[PDB]
Design a protein around this nucleic acid. Structure first.
Lengths: 128, 84, 60, 147, 102, 119
RNA sequence: UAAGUUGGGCACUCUAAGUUGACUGCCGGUGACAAACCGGAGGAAGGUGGGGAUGACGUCAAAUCAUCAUGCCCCUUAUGAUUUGGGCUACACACGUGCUACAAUGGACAAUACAAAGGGCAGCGAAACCGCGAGGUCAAGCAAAUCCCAUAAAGUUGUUCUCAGUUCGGAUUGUAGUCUGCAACUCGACUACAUGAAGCUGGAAUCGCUAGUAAUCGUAGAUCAGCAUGCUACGGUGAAUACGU
C-alpha cells in the first residue's frame, strides 16, 4: 500500500503524522485520541480538516508526538494533515486557504523583563 | 540540633573537673556558647559573657529545661517603651 | 576598613569556612561569582573590553 | 479591534456555548466549566422536560437587553442600541454574574434554575433587564438628539 | 556499538573558526585515510550572567551576558598513525580545545 | 461521654468524629481505627455497642486527656520557673528560636491599641 | 527487546552551519500623475511581521568619596590593628512591597498522561536495603545530546465530603526527631504527633493589563558549610472586552 507523511509544529511541540488510507481510526503513540486528551470533546475540531477537505473523510491515521501540553500538540495534528492532503492533490488547497488550518501559527511564548516574577504580573506604584 | 551526640566545648569540662571533684566555687568566668548543661555542671556558678559583663548565675538541678548557652539576653529591656 | 580584611580572608583559618570568596582586584565581597572571582561591576566593565570569552549578548 | 471568533463547540451542538464556557473559566481551568456546563444541559432537560436550546435560547432572549444607555457630558446619558456582539455579551455576562448571586451549593442547579426561571421571565437577570430598560427609555427626552 | 574507531571533541566560541578548523581536520583525515565522519553538530550549550547596571542601587534596570559554547563531534574508522598526525598536526587557530581520543 | 473521652457529636463519620477529643488529630485517629477494625460508613456514627467497647478501651492508648493540658502547663511553667529567657519570649510571641517581631502583634495581642510615635 | 536496547537505517524529527524568502513588492482603485491610504492574490510569514539589544543635544548642582580612583581637609601610640562574645533580626505602632487564606470551579484518599530550559568533579547521588518521615547505609554510571539532578504540577478518571468558623483554613505553642556546620541559646533548615488563630471577599481611596497578554500551575539556576514567599530565566493551561476620543 501507500501512505503520506508530514510533520506537525505548534506551541513548543512536534508531531510526525503518518497518513494511511483507511476508514479513519487514530492512535497517537499507539494510543487512541480519547486516551490522550483531557477531557476532551473538542476533538471534532481536529476533524475540521475532514469536514472541509476530503469531505467527509476519512483516512486511518498514525502519529508520534511529544512536547508541550495537550492542546498545542493536539493542534499540531492539523498541519501535517493539510500538508499531506496537498501532497495527495493540490486541488484541496483552495478550500483550505480560505479556511487556513495550514499556516503554522507563529505565535508562542514571550520572554520576561523586570516586572514579571514567579507568576506573570507586572508591578504597581507606591501610593499614599 | 545534634547529630548524635551531646558534647561540650572541652575547655569547660577541663576547668570544672578540677573545680568540682574538690570543693566548688561560687563564681566562674566563661564564654560558654558552643556548650551546655549535663550533670557535671550543676550547682557551680557559671556566667556567660552577656556582651558587656558576665553575670553570675548559679546552676540548679532543674536546669534541664533551661541550659547554659544563655540566661540573660543582649536585648535587655527592651528595646521599646511598652512591655509584654 | 577593607585593607586588613584582605589579610583576613587571605590567612589560614581555624576551620573550613569562616571564609568569603571576594573579588581579586575589587575589594568588594558581595555579588561575586566563583567561576571568575570577579565582582559585579568589574566583570561588566571588563566584559565590554572584549577581553574574556565571550558573546555577550542578547539572544535569550 | 475586530473580534477573533471562537469556532463552534459540538457539545451540545451550538456556538453560544463556546462563548459561554470561557467566562466561567475562573483562573484558566477550561475542563471544569466544560463539565459543569455540559451537565447543566443534561439536568435542565432532566427537570422540566424540554430541549436545551429551548430553555437556553429562549432565556438568553428573555434576559437580553436591546436598548441601553451610556453617559457623557452635566450628568446626561445617551440611550443607545446594542450591537449584536455586545447584545449576547451582556446577556451571558449578566447571566453568569447573577447566576453566581443565587447562592446554591451545586454546580448546575444554580444554572438550570437561572435560565429556566429566566425562560419563565423570572430571576434577577430579568430584573436587571427591567431596571436597565426602566431608567433607559424613560428619560430618553433629553439625551436622544445626538449620535 | 562495536567498531574500530577514532573520535574526538572540539570546543570553541565561534562557528566560523570552529567549522573552518573542522574543514582542516576532515580534509587531513581523509588525506591520510578514509571513512571520515563529517562535522557532526551538537546543541551548543550556553550560560547567562544577569547583572545590574549600577554601583549602588537601581536594580530594576538589569543587564545580561552569556557565553555560547560550540560543540563539535567527529569520528573516524580504521585508525592509523597518520590520521593521528592529522589530529595532533593541525588545530589552528588555537582558541579551540581539542581532546584527541579513541 | 460518649464513645470516648468527652464531647463527641452523634451521627457523624468516624474519620472526623474522633478529633474533637483533645489529643488526636486525623492520622493517629486512623491508626486507632486500624486497631479495633472500625470505619465509616458513611457520614454518620454507625458505631453500635459491639465496636463501642473496643474503641472505649483501645482509646486509653494515648495522652489524650486534659492531662495533656497540664503537661503543657508544667512544661511552660517549668520553663519560666528555672531561669529563664525562654519564658520572657514565651510572653513575646517568640519561641526558643525566634520570629522577628515587628508585625507580630496581631498573632498575640490584637492590634488595638493603634498609636504611633512617628517621627 | 523491559526498553532503540543493538543489527540495520538517516526517510522524518532533531542538532548547528550555509543560503532562499517579505522589499509598496505584484495587481486594482483612490490620491497634485507623486508621496502615501485602501482593498485583491500569493506565501509559512505583508505595510518597523512578534520581541530583544540599542537611550539625541541636555535636564533634575538627581544618586555614589562605602566598588574603585581622587583634589582638598582631618587621624595617628589611635578616626589605624588582632581576637572571643554580641548586633546588624529589638517592638506600643504606621507605611510599602509580596505569600497563603476567607471552601464546592472547593477539601481529603487512590490510579493516571503531556514539557521546556539549565546545572554536576571533589560535584551529581542510579539501583537495592532500613525508617512513618525528613533522611540513613551502599555503591554503579557520570567531566556529559550518553548518566544523575528529575515524579514535572495544574489536569483527566474514580471514592467520600453536602455548608459548619467545617476533614475550611494553617498561625502560635509543647514534645519527639533529620541534615549542615565545631556550636544551631539570641538567630538555621527540616520532618512526625498534638494544637486548630484571625478570617466567610473587603470601606474611603487605589494599582496592574489589549492575546500566548492577564489570570493561573509548577520546574531550573546564581549567591551558597547550611538558608530565597524574594531575583532571573523556563515552559504548562489560557481567556472578555477595544462602542469611541
Amino acid at each position: 500500500q501507500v501512505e503520506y507523511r508530514g510533520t506537525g509544529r505548534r506551541k513548543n511541540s512536534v508531531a510526525r503524522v503518518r497518513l494511511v488510507p483507511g476508514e479513519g481510526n487514530i492512535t497517537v503513540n499507539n494510543r487512541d485520541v480519547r486516551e490522550y486528551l483531557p477531557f476532551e470533546s473538542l476533538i471534532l475540531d481536529l476533524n475540521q480538516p475532514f469536514d472541509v477537505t476530503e469531505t467527509k473523510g476519512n483516512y486511518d491515521v498514525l502519529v508520534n508526538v511529544h512536547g508541550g501540553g495537550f492542546t498545542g500538540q493536539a493542534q499540531a495534528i492539523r498541519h501535517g494533515i493539510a500538508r499531506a492532503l496537498l501532497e495527495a492533490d493540490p486541488e484541496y488547497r483552495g478550500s483550505l486557504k480560505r479556511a487556513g488550518l495550514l499556516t503554522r501559527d507563529p505565535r508562542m511564548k514571550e520572554r520576561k523583563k523586570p516586572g514579571l516574577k514567579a507568576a506573570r504580573r507586572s508591578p504597581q506604584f507606591s501610593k499614599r | 540540633s545534634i547529630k548524635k551526640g551531646p558534647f561540650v566545648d572541652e575547655h569547660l569540662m577541663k576547668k570544672v573537673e578540677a573545680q568540682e571533684g574538690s570543693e566548688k566555687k561560687q563564681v566562674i568566668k566563661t564564654w560558654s556558647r558552643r556548650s551546655t548543661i549535663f550533670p557535671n555542671f550543676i550547682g557551680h556558678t557559671f556566667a556567660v559573657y552577656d556582651g558587656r559583663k558576665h553575670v553570675p548565675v548559679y546552676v540548679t538541678e532543674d536546669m534541664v529545661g533551661h541550659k547554659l548557652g544563655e540566661f540573660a539576653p543582649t536585648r535587655t529591656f527592651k528595646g521599646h517603651v511598652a512591655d509584654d | 576598613a577593607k585593607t586588613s580584611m584582605v589579610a583576613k580572608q587571605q590567612k589560614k583559618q581555624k576551620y573550613a569556612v569562616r571564609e568569603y570568596t571576594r573579588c581579586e582586584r575589587c575589594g568588594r565581597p558581595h555579588s561575586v561569582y566563583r567561576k571568575f572571582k570577579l565582582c559585579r561591576i568589574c566583570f561588566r566593565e571588563l566584559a565590554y573590553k572584549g577581553q574574556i570569552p565571550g558573546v555577550r549578548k542578547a539572544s535569550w | 479591534v475586530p473580534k477573533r471568533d471562537v469556532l463552534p463547540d459540538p457539545i451540545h451542538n451550538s456556538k453560544l456555548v463556546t462563548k459561554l464556557i470561557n467566562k466561567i473559566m475562573l483562573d484558566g481551568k477550561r475542563g471544569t466549566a466544560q463539565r459543569i456546563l455540559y451537565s447543566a444541559f443534561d439536568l435542565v432537560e432532566q427537570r422540566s422536560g424540554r430541549d436545551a436550546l429551548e430553555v437556553f435560547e429562549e432565556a438568553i432572549n428573555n434576559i437580553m437587553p436591546v436598548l441601553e444607555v451610556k453617559a457623557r457630558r452635566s450628568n446626561y446619558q445617551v440611550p443607545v442600541e446594542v450591537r449584536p456582539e455586545r447584545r449576547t455579551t451582556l446577556g451571558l455576562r449578566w447571566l453568569v454574574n447573577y447566576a453566581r448571586l443565587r447562592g446554591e451549593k451545586t454546580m448546575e442547579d444554580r444554572l438550570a434554575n437561572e435560565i429556566l426561571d429566566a425562560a419563565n421571565n423570572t430571576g434577577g437577570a430579568v430584573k436587571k433587564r427591567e431596571d436597565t430598560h426602566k431608567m433607559a427609555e424613560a428619560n430618553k427626552a433629553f439625551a436622544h438628539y445626538r449620535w | 556499538m562495536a567498531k574500530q574507531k577514532i573520535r574526538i571533541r572540539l570546543k570553541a566560541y565561534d562557528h566560523r573558526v570552529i567549522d573552518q578548523s573542522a574543514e582542516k581536520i576532515v580534509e587531513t583525515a581523509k588525506r591520510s585515510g578514509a571513512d571520515v565522519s563529517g562535522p557532526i553538530p551538537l546543541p551548543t550549550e550556553k550560560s547567562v550572567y544577569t547583572i545590574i547596571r549600577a554601583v549602588h542601587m537601581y536594580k530594576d534596570s538589569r543587564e545580561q551576558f552569556e557565553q555560547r559554547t560550540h560543540k563539535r563531534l567527529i569520528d573516524i574508522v580504521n585508525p592509523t598513525p597518520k590520521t593521528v598526525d592529522a589530529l595532533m598536526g593541525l588545530n589552528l587557530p588555537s582558541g579551540v580545545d581539542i581532546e584527541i581520543k579513541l | 461521654a460518649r464513645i470516648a473521652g468527652v464531647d463527641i457529636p452523634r451521627e457523624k463519620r468516624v474519620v472526623i468524629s474522633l478529633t474533637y477529643i483533645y489529643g488526636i488529630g486525623t492520622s493517629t485517629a486512623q491508626k486507632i481505627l486500624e486497631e479495633a477494625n472500625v470505619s465509616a460508613d458513611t457520614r454518620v456514627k454507625d458505631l453500635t455497642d459491639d465496636e463501642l467497647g473496643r474503641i472505649r478501651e483501645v482509646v486509653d492508648g494515648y495522652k489524650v486527656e486534659g492531662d495533656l493540658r497540664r503537661e503543657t502547663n508544667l512544661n511552660i511553667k517549668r520553663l519560666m520557673e528555672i531561669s529563664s529567657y525562654r519564658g520572657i519570649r514565651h510572653r513575646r510571641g517568640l519561641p526558643v528560636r525566634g520570629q522577628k517581631t515587628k508585625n507580630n502583634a496581631r498573632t498575640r495581642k490584637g492590634p488595638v491599641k493603634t498609636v504611633a510615635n512617628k517621627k
